[PDB]
């Protein structure tokens, strides 16, 4: 049956590392949240109570922070987040062709997850690679979009 959520050991250790890294524990909130999102494929809402304990912070504070920062997601688990730039330069150079190709390959639109929980398209603002527009990221990896065939090959690397 149900139990009070606890972090797995592997993760609890990485979390404690970030908290020990800065002079004040609360300064590690964002590194901790990036780590949680990396481990679960999202931010579980139940994970916020015990992160608050470890940060010696009120829960509402942690929740406010989670809500403010756009990289964090509490709704949709995904193995691979496909961040697609929808800002000015990528728009002019073919954001729409990249999304079309993403729909043709994966069968999904911005904001949706593939049925298997593997890929979620996440529209983002300028990714700071405007010369290589249109730009997308797959988790931490970042690329220029060239064509459907070239895109498919990139995606074939995530398994």
């Amino acid at each position: 049956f149900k139990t009070e959520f606890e972090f797995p050991e592997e993760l609890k250790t990485k979390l404690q590392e970030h908290i020990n890294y800065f002079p004040k524990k609360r300064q590690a909130i964002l590194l901790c949240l990036h780590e949680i999102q990396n481990y679960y494929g999202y931010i579980p809402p139940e994970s916020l109570k015990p992160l608050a304990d470890m940060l010696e912070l009120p829960l509402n504070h942690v929740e406010g922070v989670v809500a403010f920062y756009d990289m964090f997601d509490r709704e949709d688990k995904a193995k691979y987040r496909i961040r697609v730039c929808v800002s000015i330069v990528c728009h002019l150079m073919g954001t729409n062709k990249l999304l079309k190709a993403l729909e043709n390959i994966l069968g999904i639109k911005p904001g949706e997850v593939t049925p298997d929980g593997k890929f979620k398209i996440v529209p983002v603002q300028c990714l700071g690679a405007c010369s290589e527009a249109p730009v997308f990221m797959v988790n931490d990896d970042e690329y220029k979009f060239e064509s459907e065939v070239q895109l498919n090959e990139i995606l074939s690397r995530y398994t």
């Binding site: 890294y21 300064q27 940060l55 403010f68 330069v89 728009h91 300028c126 290589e132």
Partner: protein, 418 residues
């Protein structure tokens, strides 16, 4: 070790300073760096007093590269007039559309930045510095972490650096989606473990910043110049480019040009030159219609002969050049700028909060041909009314570019009003 994949942004320099290594699209570790005279300027700095370093940076006429263009030396002087402890922050949030200049220094020549941070920290008496790097630059983050370890190994960081008695630790923090965290007070709020809400100024960070103590925030590119000021001396540095806008400058060029990328150029270079002499001209040799200075200003084809400096008649901003050509729709482009401010307003101020949203909402209806007459008039009104009560620069500028498009491209807007 393996870092995340990065696109290979093209780089080119006529000055061979900031882009000396970073013009090569790979990581340059400490041995490569040391081989080119790396950390030698640091060693020379630690033999100088902090006061002299401030004076050198002051006399060099280096100005901030983050957008406000505040004299760097004078910022340091303001900070050191207040009792310590003092803190130093390198701002690596670079999240403005079109701007990709800071990242190529971080990802390709990290030690140029770290060396800059140490001298600057020493200059202001700060024993704790931070790099705040946007969360969408994961590779940069890991490159900086590894590079900081290399610096410790060679004793450029830690306690009693090189027998000098100066102690320093650089911490690397990551952002998580907010452009507003590039604003220096919101940056500091984020580093204190909070939401990136800009603070009312005064007080300014140099008197009260991180934990209420004097804080110098400086942009990556600004800090990357510090090595050269010390190494060459303030006098030789000031001889680079026009004497009133001295030093190397990085110009991120994107959009409808043959050779998009970062160019290191003197600031007496004209906008026409950036596009046509360096960036290879336009795709298909089509005419220039407009150049967006990031999400800040919009220049017409009639405004190309302006210097890429911080003169009132100059290009301004951070030197971000986005080229649109004759077939690009200015209203569609304006929509994209509107959407950006819509997504990045922190919401603390009511005219910013509601104006950013309404500007984008109404402009979307104008572009899709669903706008009523009252929506047209409302759009015009909200565009002029984002700034009131605003406590940071976002609110002051969220309508600026779009307003210039309305003034400089009326015939294209009128087409939509019909």
């Amino acid at each position: 070790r393996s870092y995340p994949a990065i696109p290979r942004i093209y780089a080119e320099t006529t000055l061979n300073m900031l882009l000396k290594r970073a013009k090569k699209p790979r990581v340059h570790s400490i041995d490569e760096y040391l081989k080119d005279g790396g950390y030698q300027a640091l060693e020379k700095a630690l033999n100088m007093s902090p006061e002299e370093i401030i004076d050198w940076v002051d006399k060099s006429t280096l100005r901030g590269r983050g957008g406000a263009g505040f004299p760097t030396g004078k910022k340091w002087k303001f900070a050191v007039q207040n009792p310590g402890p003092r803190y130093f922050i390198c701002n690596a949030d670079e999240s403005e559309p079109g701007t990709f200049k800071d990242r190529i220094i971080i990802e390709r020549d990290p030690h140029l930045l770290i060396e800059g941070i140490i001298i600057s920290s020493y200059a202001i008496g700060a024993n704790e510095a931070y790099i705040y790097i946007r969360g969408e630059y994961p590779a940069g983050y890991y490159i900086l972490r590894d590079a900081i370890e290399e610096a410790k190994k060679k004793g450029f960081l830690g306690k009693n650096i090189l027998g000098s008695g100066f102690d320093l630790e650089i911490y690397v923090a990551r952002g998580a989606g907010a452009y507003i965290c590039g604003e220096e007070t919101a940056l500091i709020e984020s580093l204190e473990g909070k939401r990136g809400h800009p603070r009312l100024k005064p007080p300014y960070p140099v008197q009260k910043g991180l934990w209420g103590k004097p804080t110098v925030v400086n942009n990556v590119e600004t800090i990357a110049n510090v090595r050269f000021i010390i190494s060459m001396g303030w006098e030789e540095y000031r001889y680079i480019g026009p004497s009133d806008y001295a030093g190397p400058k990085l110009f991120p060029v994107s959009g409808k040009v043959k050779k998009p990328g970062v160019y290191e150029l003197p600031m007496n270079t004209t906008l026409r030159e950036v596009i046509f002499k360096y960036a290879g001209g336009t795709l298909g040799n089509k005419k220039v219609k407009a150049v967006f200075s990031g999400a800040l200003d919009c220049f017409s084809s009639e405004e190309l002969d302006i210097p890429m400096d911080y003169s009132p008649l100059g290009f301004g901003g951070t030197g971000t050049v986005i080229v649109l050509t004759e077939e690009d729709d200015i209203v569609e482009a304006a929509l994209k700028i509107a959407e950006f401010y819509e997504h990045e307003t922190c919401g603390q101020c009511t005219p910013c909060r509601v104006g950013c949203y309404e500007q984008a909402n109404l402009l979307e209806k104008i572009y899709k041909g669903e706008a009523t007459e009252q929506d047209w008039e409302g759009f015009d009104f909200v565009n002029r009314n984002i700034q009131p009560t605003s406590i940071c620069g976002l609110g002051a500028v969220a309508g600026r570019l779009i307003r210039q498009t309305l003034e400089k491209f009326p015939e294209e807007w009128e087409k939509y009003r019909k």
